[PDB]
Design a protein around this ligand. Structure first.
Ligand code: ZN
Lengths: 266, 119, 442, 97
């Protein structure tokens, strides 16, 4: 069996990932241009976090990489809407007066705000064979990664923009065949006065999950999923024949529920 | 009339079937799924390791006949990729950064037909 | 352990009946009408074909049998190759092929392979260490047949080969080895002394054909085979007789020497024009890949034209003692001699794209990056244009203004992101943004 | 061929890239057949061999029928409804009164 985490996270205007020219990294989807965060950036920011390291054959070598093959799988963070890069015109100042009101430096930097969709995958069999039959430590490191990935962000240009946002929707599912839900945002999300950017993204995710539940995923095997938003801020498919098996309003409760499903450990 | 061929749907947001002409820090790609790539996908789906693949599984599965139909060509998108930034790199070691540029296919879909033995 | 290459199966071939094989040299000369050279690295393919061309030149010189088009094989070459068995010899003392006197400078045998990292080269794409991995004898001959065309500078006290930095290499193509040889057949005046003879005491102002086309810029002496059980880390073939070390020595190239490879491309000053690819996209360079457009001016201006044919166009790019990239591209041509203004403009496409990307909408000077989002869509449009390189070069169905439409669809999607408002003014700036077409200038 | 959103157009000529088949009679491949280098043997010391590959094309509609998209839409917040004639509300108001 396989565990899959889908994540919706809006960010304040910043530049969390750059390239050789300073522009935010982008990609192409749905016929339009979307903002992107490269997968290795997310994996590095998760791995080298001090709070993560102070929390938990080594558990990081078992989960991540160094034939030791990692059970972790981080996909590129596509955006659920058309990218909107912007230029900020900065001017440096001199504290010493001169013959004119010169600057000292003149230039332009780039920034962009986006609502990213993140996909994660953990192979339970590879994880338990990596630690030679141990299960409690496997559940412990799964929970540690869940808290870390829920409470971390890249450090790119964070001394000037400080985009320390938090996720607004998490969906943890158990199934065999790996399918991601990037096809939900093939149509880019366009805002309306009666909703938010996060609300419409979560609703479109719910619509895609409903459509695929009515389709391929027959009664061969049930699919167990858990949906989390802080203090039940956003519902994924209100009623809708219980598209999500649970609705959670605290990170600890979701971590405990996933742990109790995977092994019943606490 | 038992079935004799298997169909693969290869469609994702980002795809990269690497080509033979990379050989260096310019990781290129091919326009279509290569035979070795889909063979490795099959062997990973069957739980066969790299060492175990070279004895019987790859010679057995190399006799099939393969054809790929293009549903969406996709767009080739590059990615600046640094390794070992703020950390040392292997070979003793060195405090240095490795630069590379990877290539992916974006918004592409392929259909793979692999005709062979019904079993 | 002698391992004569005339009888041992070392060259990897593919038969036109779909059967791959690993065959010898005599069999290659016998069935050059029904085989093709099978090598993943284009560099290895080019240098192997160069070695077969050199052997054909020597065989024609000493047998006086000129090869004919659309023929299986010029006869009596195989007995003549058999009369010289003692020369093309590997380890076992005596005369040794492409192998000079042993010395004290000992390096790992992977020194002569560019792709495999060694000697403070970072290992991230091939996990190996020096004096731990080994090479089979076929890969040893493959590495030995690389110095005169694909060597680079070293550190302090080590220079480069007879070609200075490795330039572009251009030559013709066919459907099989015999047709390839016949299409690429061109005898010279001064054959000279080939390096497999042994007498390297040239000391002459003029360099002969076989003297220079086999001009090894290093003195090497590879060691004896070592028993073991591993796989060669260049081809992966499971073998037990792996060699693990060699000895090297640098032979400096004397200045005031004239030697022109009849497959290369030179600048206006004869400065060994090199493929200009990188991986950084700096101020003076914008990454667009596939540097095929550069050497089709100098090669198509001095005796490199045969009207019809297929251009093979091996491209190896490096900067000082650091290999960057290697690629290849065939180009189909029929003739149709054209002017030089469009040829010169097409040959300078690298700086035309860099002017497109580096154009901002504000008043800063040249210390700027311009619009970086154009640089992301430039490689795809360049690759899509590159499908018709023959028509672009011959200018019979393609043109610069014909190719400007390929950016038109790509630039429509970028404008929706740079000017995302729904006002009239934003629509106007989006309309002006699609007009950004590259300008040819030299 | 499965279609995305209703406005989206479709490619008109679909290229197929297929392995060349000798048939034991046409022992020599045509000149358009090109060599790709993706026939594997091992993976840890990765080894490949070439193969002759040909490229043909298909016409959509004649060869592949365009499939129809599943029931889906862009998510919109529920604008509710409105109906008083409804008898259930006509009795709910009586209960309230
Ligand atoms: Zn080898």
């Amino acid at each position: 069996m396989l565990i899959e985490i889908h994540m919706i996270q809006n960010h304040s205007p910043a530049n969390l990932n750059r390239d050789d020219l300073g522009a935010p990294k982008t990609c192409y989807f749905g016929g339009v241009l979307r903002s992107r965060i490269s997968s290795q950036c997310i994996k590095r920011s998760i791995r080298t976090s001090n709070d993560f390291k102070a929390l938990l054959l080594a558990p990081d070598i078992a989960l991540c990489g160094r034939t030791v093959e990692a059970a972790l799988q981080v996909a590129h963070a596509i955006s659920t809407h058309i990218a909107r890069p912007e230029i900020d015109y900065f001017v440096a100042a001199d504290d010493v007066p001169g013959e004119d009101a010169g600057a000292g430096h003149i230039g332009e930097s780039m920034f962009a705000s986006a609502c990213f969709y993140k996909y994660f995958s953990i192979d339970w069999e590879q994880l338990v064979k990596n630690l030679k039959g141990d299960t409690n430590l496997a559940a412990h490191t799964v929970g540690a990664f869940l808290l870390a990935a829920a409470k971390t962000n890249p450090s790119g240009k964070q001394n000037s923009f400080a985009a320390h946002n938090y996720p607004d929707g998490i969906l943890v599912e158990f199934k065999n065949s790996p399918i991601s839900y990037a096809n939900a945002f093939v149509r880019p999300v366009s805002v309306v006065k009666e909703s938010d950017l996060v609300e419409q993204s979560i609703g479109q995710l719910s619509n895609y999950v409903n459509d695929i539940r009515l389709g391929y995923y027959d009664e061969q095997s049930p699919v167990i999923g858990f949906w989390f938003s802080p203090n039940n801020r956003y519902p994924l498919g209100y009623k809708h024949s219980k598209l999500a098996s649970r609705n959670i309003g605290n990170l600890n409760e979701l971590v405990g529920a996933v742990l109790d499903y995977i092994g019943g450990f606490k | 009339a038992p079935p004799n061929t298997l169909f693969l749907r290869l469609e994702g947001a980002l795809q990269s079937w690497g080509s033979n002409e990379a050989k260096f820090a310019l990781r290129r790609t091919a326009d279509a799924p290569t035979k070795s790539g889909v063979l490795g996908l099959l062997c990973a789906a069957m739980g066969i390791g790299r060492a175990e693949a070279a004895d019987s599984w790859l010679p057995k599965l190399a006799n099939l006949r393969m054809g790929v139909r293009i549903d969406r060509p996709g767009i080739r998108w590059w990615d600046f990729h640094t390794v070992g930034a703020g950390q040392r790199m292997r070979m003793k070691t060195r405090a240095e950064t490795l630069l590379s540029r990877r290539e992916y296919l974006a918004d592409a879909s392929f259909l793979v037909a692999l005709q062979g033995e019904p079993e | 352990v002698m391992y004569n290459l005339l009888c041992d199966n070392w060259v990897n071939v593919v038969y036109l009946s779909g059967k791959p094989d690993r065959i010898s040299l005599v069999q290659t000369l016998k069935d050059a009408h029904c085989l093709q050279l099978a090598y993943s690295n284009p560099m290895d393919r080019f240098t192997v074909f160069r070695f077969l061309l050199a052997l054909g030149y020597w065989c024609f010189a000493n047998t006086n049998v000129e090869p004919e088009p659309d023929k299986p094989l010029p006869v009596s070459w195989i007995p003549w190759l058999e009369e010289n068995k003692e020369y093309f010899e590997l380890f076992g003392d005596g005369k040794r092929f492409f192998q000079a006197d042993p010395s004290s400078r000992i390096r790992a045998i992977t020194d002569l392979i560019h792709e495999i990292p060694t000697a403070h080269n970072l290992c991230h794409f091939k996990h190996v260490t020096d004096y731990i991995d080994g090479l089979c004898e076929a890969c040893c001959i493959k590495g030995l047949l690389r110095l005169p065309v694909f060597t680079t500078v070293g550190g302090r006290g080590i220079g480069a080969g007879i070609n200075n930095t490795p330039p572009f290499y251009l030559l013709w193509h066919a459907n099989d080895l015999a047709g390839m040889l016949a299409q690429n057949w061109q005898p010279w005046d001064n054959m000279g002394i080939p390096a497999w003879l042994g007498s390297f005491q040239k000391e002459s102002r003029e360099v002969g054909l076989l003297a220079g086309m086999t001009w090894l810029p290093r003195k090497v002496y590879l060691h004896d085979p070592v028993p073991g059980q591993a796989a060669c880390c260049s081809c992966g073939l499971p073998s037990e007789a792996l060699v693990y070390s060699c000895s090297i020595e640098v032979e400096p190239v004397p200045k005031g020497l004239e030697w022109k490879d009849p497959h290369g491309v030179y600048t206006d000053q004869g400065k060994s024009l090199q493929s200009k690819i990188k991986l950084m996209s700096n101020d003076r360079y914008t990454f667009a890949d596939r540097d095929w457009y550069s050497p089709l001016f100098s090669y198509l201006h001095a005796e490199g034209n045969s009207r019809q044919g297929k251009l093979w166009l091996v491209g190896f790019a490096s900067d000082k003692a650091k290999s960057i990239d290697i690629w290849d591209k065939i180009i189909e041509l029929e003739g149709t001699d054209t002017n030089d203004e469009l040829l010169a403009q097409l040959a300078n496409r690298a700086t035309a794209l860099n002017a497109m990307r580096k154009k901002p909408l504000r008043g800063d000077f040249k210390k700027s990056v311009g619009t970086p989002q154009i640089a992301d869509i430039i490689p795809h449009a360049e690759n899509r244009i590159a499908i018709n390189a023959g028509k672009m070069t011959e200018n019979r169905g393609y043109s610069w203004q014909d190719a400007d439409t390929e950016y038109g669809e790509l630039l429509t999607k970028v404008a929706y992101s740079l000017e995302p408002a729904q006002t009239v003014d934003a629509r106007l700036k989006r309309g002006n943004f699609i007009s950004r077409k590259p300008w040819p200038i030299i | 061929l499965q279609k995305r959103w209703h406005n989206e157009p479709l490619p008109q000529i679909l290229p197929c890239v297929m392995d060349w088949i000798p048939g034991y009679d046409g022992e020599h491949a045509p000149d358009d057949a090109e060599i790709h280098y993706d026939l594997p043997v091992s993976f840890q010391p990765p080894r490949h061999l070439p193969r002759f590959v040909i490229r043909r094309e298909l016409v959509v509609g004649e060869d592949v029928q365009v499939s129809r998209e599943t029931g889906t839409s862009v998510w919109r917040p529920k604008g509710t409804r409105a109906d008083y004639n409804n008898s259930e509300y006509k009795k709910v108001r009586a209960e309230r009164l």
